[PDB]
């Protein structure tokens, strides 16, 4: 989930059922949203699965400094520094 730390925040989520292309991280102002959507039309099969998470960003984080990465074990991290002295 979301961790506020002294000099940063960090969001860590399990997304192992999603490929990187099926993930979206949106940062709009003080809100971060993470979405995943997987759809496929399998003879009969149709499968869809989705997730959505939203978190509020602390006011002393410049949203433009927020970045994200995906580990090979399928853990998605989104983090950003807080303004430092």
């Amino acid at each position: 989930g979301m961790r506020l730390e002294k000099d940063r925040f960090s969001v860590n989520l399990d997304v192992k059922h999603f490929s990187p292309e099926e993930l979206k991280v949106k940062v709009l102002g003080d809100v971060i949203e993470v979405h995943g959507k997987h759809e496929e039309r399998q003879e009969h099969g149709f499968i869809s699965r989705c997730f959505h998470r939203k978190y509020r960003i602390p006011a002393d984080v410049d949203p433009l400094t927020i970045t994200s990465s995906l580990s090979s074990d399928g853990v998605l991290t989104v983090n950003g520094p807080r303004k430092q002295v």
Partner: peptide, 9 residues
Amino acid sequence: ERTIPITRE
């Protein structure tokens, strides 16, 4: 780790 692009619109 792979970098994940951030959508800002």
